[PDB]
Amino acid sequence: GLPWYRVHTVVLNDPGRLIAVHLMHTSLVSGWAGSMAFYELAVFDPSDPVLNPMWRQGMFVLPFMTRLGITQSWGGWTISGETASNPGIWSYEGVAAAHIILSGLLFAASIWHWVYWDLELFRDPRTSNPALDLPKIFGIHLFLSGLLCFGFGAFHVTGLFGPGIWVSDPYGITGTVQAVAPSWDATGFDPYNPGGISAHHIAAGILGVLAGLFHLCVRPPQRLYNGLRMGNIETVLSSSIAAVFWAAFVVSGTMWYGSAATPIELFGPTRYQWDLGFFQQEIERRVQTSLAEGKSASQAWAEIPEKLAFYDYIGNNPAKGGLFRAGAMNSGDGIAVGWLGHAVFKDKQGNELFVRRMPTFFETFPVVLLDKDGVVRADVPFRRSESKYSIEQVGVSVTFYGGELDGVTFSDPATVKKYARRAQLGEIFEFDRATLQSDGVFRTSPRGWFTFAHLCFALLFFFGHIWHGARTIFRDVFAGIDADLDEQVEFGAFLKLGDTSTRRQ
Amino acid sequence: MEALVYTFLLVGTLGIIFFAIFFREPPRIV
Amino acid sequence: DTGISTPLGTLLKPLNSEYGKVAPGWGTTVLMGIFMALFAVFLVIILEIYNSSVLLDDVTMSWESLA
Amino acid sequence: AATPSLNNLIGSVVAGGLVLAAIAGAITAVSNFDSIRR
Amino acid sequence: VNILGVIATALFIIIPTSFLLILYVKTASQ
Amino acid sequence: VNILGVIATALFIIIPTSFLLILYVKTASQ
Amino acid sequence: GTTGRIPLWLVGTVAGVAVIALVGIFFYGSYVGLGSSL
Amino acid sequence: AKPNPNKQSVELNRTSLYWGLLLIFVLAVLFSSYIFN
Amino acid sequence: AKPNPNKQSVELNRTSLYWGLLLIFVLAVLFSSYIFN
Amino acid sequence: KIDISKQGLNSIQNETVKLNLMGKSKTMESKDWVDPQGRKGKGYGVYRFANKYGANVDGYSPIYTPDTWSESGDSYKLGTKGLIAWAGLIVVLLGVGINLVISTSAL
Amino acid sequence: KRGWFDVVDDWLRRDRFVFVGWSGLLLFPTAYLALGGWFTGTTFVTSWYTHGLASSYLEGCNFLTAAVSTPANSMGHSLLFLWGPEAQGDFTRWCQLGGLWTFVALHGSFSLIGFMLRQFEIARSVKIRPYNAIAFSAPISVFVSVFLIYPLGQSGWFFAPSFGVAAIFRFILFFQGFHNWTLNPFHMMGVAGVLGAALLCAIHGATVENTLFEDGDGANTFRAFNPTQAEETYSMVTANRFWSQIFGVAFSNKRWLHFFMLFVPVTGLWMSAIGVVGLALNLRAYDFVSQEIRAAEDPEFETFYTKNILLNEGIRAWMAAQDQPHEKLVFPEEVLPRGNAL
Amino acid sequence: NRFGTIALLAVPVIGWVLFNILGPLQNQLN
Amino acid sequence: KSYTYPIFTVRWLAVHALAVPTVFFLGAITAMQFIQR
Amino acid sequence: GATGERPFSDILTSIRYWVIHSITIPSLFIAGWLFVSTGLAYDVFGSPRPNEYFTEDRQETPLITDRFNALEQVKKLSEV
Ligand code: CLA
Ligand code: CLA
Ligand code: CLA
Ligand SMILES: CCCCCCCCCCCCCCCC(=O)OC[C@H](COP(=O)(O)OC[C@@H](O)CO)OC(=O)CCCCCCCCCCCCCCC
Ligand SMILES: CCCCCCCCCCCCCCCCCC(=O)OC[C@H](COP(=O)(O)O)OC(=O)CCCCCCCCCCCCCCCCC
Ligand SMILES: CC1=C(/C=C/C(C)=C/C=C/C(C)=C/C=C/C=C(C)/C=C/C=C(C)/C=C/C2=C(C)CCCC2(C)C)C(C)(C)CCC1
Ligand SMILES: CC1=C(/C=C/C(C)=C/C=C/C(C)=C/C=C/C=C(C)/C=C/C=C(C)/C=C/C2=C(C)CCCC2(C)C)C(C)(C)CCC1
Ligand SMILES: CC1=C(/C=C/C(C)=C/C=C/C(C)=C/C=C/C=C(C)/C=C/C=C(C)/C=C/C2=C(C)CCCC2(C)C)C(C)(C)CCC1
Ligand SMILES: CC/C=C/C/C=C\C/C=C/CCCCCCCC(=O)O
Ligand SMILES: CC/C=C\C/C=C\C/C=C\CCCCCCCC(=O)O
Ligand SMILES: CCCCCCCCCCCCCCCCCC(=O)O
Secondary structure, three states: OEOHHHHHHHHOOOHHHHHHHHHHHHHHHHHHHHHHHHHHHHHOOOOOOOOOOHHHHOOOHHHHHHHOOOOEOOOOEEOOOOEOOOOOOOOHHHHHHHHHHHHHHHHHHHHHHHHOOOEHHHEOOOOOOEOOOHHHHHHHHHHHHHHHHHHHHHHHOOOOOOOOEEEEOOOOOOEEEEOOOOOOOHHHHOOOOOHHHHHHHHHHHHHHHHHHHHHHHOOOEHHHHHHHOOOOOHHHHHHHHHHHHHHHHHHHHHHHHOEOOEOHHHHOOOHHHHOOOHHHHHHHHHHHHHHHOOOOHHHHHHOOOHHHHHOOEOOOOOOOOOOOOOOOOHHHHOEEEEEOOEEEEEOOOOOEEEEOOOOOOOOOOOOEEEOOOOOEEEEOOOOOOOOOOEHHHHOOEEEEEOOOOOOOEEOOHHHHHHHHHHOOOEOOEEEEOOOOOOOOOOOOOHHHHHHHHHHHHHHHHHHHHHHHHHHHHOOOOOOOOOOOOHHHHOOOOEOEOOOOOOEOO | OHHHHHHHHHHHHHHHHHHHHHOOOOOOOO | OOOEOOHHHHHHHHHHOOOOOOEOOOOOHHHHHHHHHHHHHHHHHHHHHHHOOOOOOOOOOOHHHHO | OOOHHHHHHHHHHHHHHHHHHHHHHHHHHHHHHOOOOO | OOOOHHHHHHHHHHHHHHHHHHHHHHHHHO | OOOOHHHHHHHHHHHHHHHHHHHHHHHHHO | OEEOOOOHHHHHHHHHHHHHHHHHHHHHHHOOOOOOOO | OOOOOOOOOEOOOHHHHHHHHHHHHHHHHHHHHHHHO | OOOOOOOOOOOOOHHHHHHHHHHHHHHHHHHHHHHHO | OOOHHHOOOOOOOOHHHHHHHOOOOOOOOOOOOEOOOOOEOOOOOOOOOHHHHOOOOOOOOOOOOHHHOOOOOOEEOOHHHHHHHHHHHHHHHHHHHHHHHHHHOOO | OOOHHHHHHHHHOEOOOOOOOOOHHHHHHHHHHHHHHHHHHOOOOOEOOOOOEOOOOOOOOOOOOOEEOOOOHHHOOOOOOOOOOOOOOOHHHHHHOOHHHHHHHHHHHHHHHHHHHHHHHHHHHHOOOOHHHHHOHHHHHHHHHHHHHHHHOOOOOOOOOOEEHHHHHHHHHHHHHHHOHHHOHHHHHHHHHHHHHHHHHHHHHHHHHOOEOOOOOOOOHHHOOOOOOOOOOEOHHHHHHHHHHHOOOOOOOHHHHHHHHHHHHHHHHHHHHHHHHHHOOOOOOOOOHHHHHHHHHOOOOOOHHHHHHHHHHHHHHHHHHHHOHHHOOOOOOOOOOOOOOO | OHHHHHHHHHHHHHHHHHHHHHHHHHHHHO | OOOOOOOOOHHHHHHHHHHHHHHHHHHHHHHHOOOOO | OOOOOOOHHHHOOOHHHHHHHHHHHHHHHHHHHHHHHOOHHHHHHOOOOHHHOOOOOOOOOOOOOOOOOHHHHHHHHOOO
């Protein structure tokens, strides 16, 4: 009988049951989408969108729904923390219910197509045998894909008919869903320019329609037909697997490095925003601008948004998690509730010291304090028998500007050490580690989870493409080689390898 | 609680080994 | 045993009628190769734009281009 | 305008095309010079 | 220790085991 | 709520289901 | 003109002696000069 | 209409059953130790 | 020695499979509600 | 199936080496042959099915066939004058090379 | 054969001492360039300006300590072309900046692609099945994940591996100290597969060689074989009985035996590749939270896992200063973790 | 001039080779 | 019979491409052994 | 088992072969020796001579910090 790994090959030459199994797969995928949306809606907390965003709570499919212009819920709340005004049919719950209904309809259609498999549409007119004309089907489907791409990019993104896409400022503080105009110059290929999306979709849709018409009109060459085995349905499978693993690599790279299609306000900051001082440089620039305007240090540090401070956190860095650290980031660090303030460390003589920030690579980092010239001035020693830069010797004190602890100065060496330990992670915050019983180890964000999953899928699908291409090209020897073959494989028997018409030498 | 699961897994693997050794399909010369 | 007849199947029948019809010879392979070469050049250009191996005046290639 | 990096990119594309053309020409020359007479 | 590991371990043990048992019993009967 | 009810429910659902499926698949093949 | 062939075993002996001398020179140079720790 | 001409019967012998059981249980050992944390 | 003369083959039809599945799931409903407490 | 005479092993002077390269040995086919340790032979020879398949693996894929060697190469066409020119050239080149090595170094 | 394609295919797919084929045009130039780049970098090019070391025979390094070093971390993920906006056409400064590493890696990947294509083409010319070409996917995946995907998810080619013996040793030690790579289940599957493949190779060779048939009268049994013979040269029944009575289980199918031989190392290497792909994003199975919490609450609980954690901390602290010059880590001697009297 | 020395060293080598192998090479070409 | 063989072939090119730089590099490495720091 | 090329054992035992190759191999060896000894190896590939690892300006290891000014930075670091 058939081995357990060859069961699904029964529908290779059955177009009706191939359609049936594809319909079943589509039904399962739609059902997963709807159920995941409902489950995420049942556990989402929209009370605080500043210190408890979607990515801290660990929502996966919710940012993908929010990216295309869905912000209201039937529960009365809005993703920006406002009050919903006539949510309409297309809310989170409405979309989930639509997906569930579509899954049911696809299930019914799959049953119908499995039962009625002997449609005469699937027969070859000149032989009365089941067959498919793959080049023309490709033409039809390419035409439809180009039409859909043009429609999306022209009506949804541009706001002519649809809502638009999510656009935010570079630091992810003020971001809403808005219409995007196309960009046709060289700036349309900037990955952080939102107009490139609409421009690309319009141009690619037009080209797809033109190519679909070409493939509907022109028959394939005989040499290409024989070479690529266009009469086999497995070459389509190999080529499609190649295309999808290419796309998986592209989307994984785009999500990891960030672009206009992956907003940080929806997915989380990237590791390069931490290991390059993006938010820290912005914060320092804002503080200096305020200070030059004749304001005190506390006043300058009191106008910095808490969201901008929260973005400057190695806990929010996505490259600090673990493979088996399950759950949301709130489950590992606790729910943030307030910004303590900017900790300023001062030498006993008044000189100001800075704590060397912990790099992304290190799980644990030593605590050292540097001055403005980068020279070490204090540290927390490991060997306390002899010390030259001890905090007790130097006499370092910490003062907080802005935030919860504005104007509070600590001089106790234990408290100073404790606060200098938290300055490594960036901006000191206050967390609630009792609501969810957080263990105390950093987790990863949807950015990291998406990148990991899709890289693994891309590699496995590369193997699948190789296997299926080998199977479709080497189809006649799938059961074994010919009984007598030594004459062809004899060394030097023929001038050309495997050609019996060039016998010499 | 997890110690019971670990012991059950190890015992099941050992039982599978025993059954594979002593209840194999016997080879037959054609 | 011709098969199950259906109005929609009869409507879509001409779209699945020419199975092995091919153009003799090499056909339009050279045109396809030209388009493939153009696609490869375009992909190289955009990859170098993202990789910062090519620098353009108007293109910023940073988070600051969202301003 | 065009930056020097763009000029280098275009030159590299042209050089790759030249290398492919030279390889193809050499292969064609040797294939025509030494053929198999069936 | 994650108390959700027990259900995951049980499902991963049982479902493939049941699939294999179905296949083998069918083959042996045939 | 007893969190040990999930594993009990899963086992009670799955084991008799697998037994019935084994028997039915064997009979249908035969 | 000059009939005769060089013995293959003689060729092998000379080649082996040459490679052994090369390896010995490499070891001696590892013990003195650059990268000799002194 | 007429019975489907693409009918096949799956099979699995005792060696395959033993290999599958061993694979399942070894993977369960390793990844259960890692998932319980 | 000789093959066992008491060899029998079990069977179960689709009606019995459906009845068993229904019984299992209804019992699961009732006693799961009562066991979760 | 295999003709031993057509395997290109007929141009070997040493009879024992020639027999070795074809995987043949007249001594071992004798029923009274005894190897160094003292075990009698069954008459098989080097290979049992030598008659069925023509020859051995040694007589099937040899790696030293003097028959296929070119007739040229066993005699130098340039003769004694070529060898004298080669000797002069090699002496000159050795002198030049040693002079260059000494001069370019630090003495 | 009259067309250009036909005559070119006639010449390319010719029966030669070295088979060229259509894939030769991609394999031979790139492979030659990669080999030449490695041999040039290990002999003449240094690593002083990009790593702060010496990695050439010219500077006084042997075969073990010579390597082609990676670019500096400032260059990020730049492809570092000879004509790029960094080297700007200067060959000497391109070599000094570390452009030979990217040269070698980018040509080696295409050489691997060409080699699998050559395997496919030769298999199709001889009319056999492409299982040897399928088996090369495991080495190709290992190379792709280790040398491309892992650096692409990190700071860059600086944290990519270098092409040398001691450089690879440093890469391995870094992976232990920072990632706890030994505690990764995917790496465990990989090492299990490699060791099982070695076991299978040795056991199959010994079993075949010790169950031979008497097809000759000489003690040298290598001369009692002929490749064109029909009957098998060893006793499968005897081998099966021996291994059934010694081990408990044994093979009774040659085809299944050899497919298992093919299957084990490929699966091991693929699992290791998946593990390294996961590690590219610092998704490391580094710690057990329950064990850490128990050891924190109870100062008497100790296992080998905690000792390994302490060893990793020491490795990180003492290697960080020199392995990563860009971070400019200055560590006073009293902050480095250290044991008593050692 | 340093490369010129190596080129001048290489010239007599190619001269000697051409002197030795020209005849058979021409024979092979025809 | 007479055997005549071509002198320059693909094998010739492969052998010499692998061999000439090898000898050049070996000479360079041998010269490298006598340098004093 | 012949693909149409001269046997290697036939070539390697030829007076012509060993007359041609009594010049080429030593010539290449001497060429490599002269390439190393004349200082060309240092200049072509930019490796530091033993006396020019540290200059009078900086006594620490070089460090490149800029990606687009890398050419000028490595030109400044290599200054003697
Ligand atoms: C890793 C090696 C690899 C191997 C061995 C194969 C092998 C195969 N491929 Mg797959 N393939 C691969 C990777 C690979 N592929 C990649 C990365 C893609 C892109 C998604 C594809 C996409 C693909 C398609 C679309 C098809 C196949 C099919 C095939 C089959 C034969 C046809 C073939 O030779 O295509 C040629 C494959 C190549 C990889 C060689 C081209 C070499 C490129 C062009 C190098 C040029 C260099 C580059 C421009 C340098 C500058 C770049 C720089 C800026 C970075 C065979 C199973 C065909 C088939 O018959 O399927 C049934 C087919 O339909 N493949
Ligand atoms: C056999 C195939 C081959 C392949 C696939 C590669 C592949 C690669 N090489 Mg190597 N190389 C080769 C042979 C090859 N090389 C040879 C023979 C040499 C001479 C020694 C070199 C020397 C070399 C150098 C010096 C460098 C590389 C590098 C690279 C990369 C080039 C990036 C680039 O932008 O390409 C060009 C882009 C293309 C997409 C070319 C295809 C364009 C198509 C054909 C369109 C033609 C259209 C055009 C407008 C018209 C031309 C026709 C007309 C002029 C006749 C890439 C990984 C770089 C490197 O590794 O950096 C780290 C680099 O520095 N290579
Ligand atoms: C794009 C979708 C795709 C499709 C439609 C196919 C289709 C097919 N494959 Mg290919 N394949 C793919 C991708 C795909 N493959 C990939 C990515 C790989 C690499 C892993 C392979 C590797 C592969 C192999 C090694 C083989 C096939 C074979 C086959 C045929 C029979 C499959 C079988 O019966 O499984 C029946 C499967 C099972 C009874 C249980 C498998 C359960 C797996 C182990 C995990 C559970 C999966 C989970 C529930 C869903 C996955 C989530 C999703 C993200 C992937 C069929 C033509 C077979 C063949 O060629 O036949 C001649 C075969 O030997 N495929
Ligand atoms: C006194 C004896 C001393 C040594 C005792 C050795 C005991 C171990 C025997 C194990 C047999 C299991 C085989 C299963 C599968 C089975 O039934 O094998 C039987 C199988 C049958 O081969 P056939 O040729 O009959 O298969 C025909 C094909 O059609 C199959 O599809 O033979 C093999 O594959 C041999 C390979 C053994 C590989 C052993 C794997 C290593 C064991 C793993 C240990 C885990 C320990 C965990 C502890 C917590
Ligand atoms: C630690 C907890 C212990 C308690 C819980 C145990 C849970 C597992 C319960 C099932 C135990 C095994 C049931 C075997 C049922 C078949 C009966 C049989 O072998 O008849 C011989 C049977 C005799 O019948 P005859 O052929 O008609 O003479 O011999 C055969 O060859 C029959 C064909 C089946 C052979 C066995 C197939 C594989 C069975 C599963 C192997 C793994 C079992 C679990 C191992 C670990 C247990 C902890
Ligand atoms: C009948 C009907 C209906 C209904 C329907 C429904 C209600 C449906 C549902 C559906 C559903 C509710 C579905 C679901 C699905 C799901 C799925 C399909 C899942 C899957 C999953 C998976 C596959 C996973 C996997 C994994 C794991 C396990 C872990 C980790 C890794 C991975 C991810 C691989 C209505 C009335 C409406 C209408 C009419 C008809
Ligand atoms: C051929 C061949 C080969 C080889 C090689 C080689 C390298 C060799 C060598 C060899 C040799 C190289 C040898 C030698 C020997 C020697 C001897 C044997 C000696 C002795 C001596 C003596 C005995 C002494 C004595 C004395 C004394 C004590 C006192 C005083 C006086 C006198 C000095 C007399 C090969 C492996 C490649 C391969 C195969 C073939
Ligand atoms: C970079 C580059 C390039 C290329 C180049 C080339 C392609 C080169 C090549 C090169 C080569 C191709 C080299 C080679 C070398 C070799 C060597 C250096 C060898 C050595 C050896 C040895 C040392 C040996 C040893 C031994 C003995 C004695 C005993 C036994 C074992 C053995 C065998 C290991 C070009 C211009 C295109 C472009 C730009 C860049
Ligand atoms: C992809 C197929 C072949 C690729 C081969 C690629 C390159 C061959 C080598 C080129 C050397 C550099 C040529 C261009 C340098 C820059 C020119 C300029 O500054 O304009
Ligand atoms: C096949 C691809 C078709 C079309 C796209 C190709 C090229 C478009 C690029 C440039 C043309 C417009 C810009 C001309 C130069 C002026 C640039 C400027 O002033 O900004
Ligand atoms: C056929 C598929 C079933 C359709 C289901 C429709 C009902 C799903 C939504 C039910 C809850 C909607 C309002 C929720 C109000 C609760 C407040 C909150 O959401 O936090």
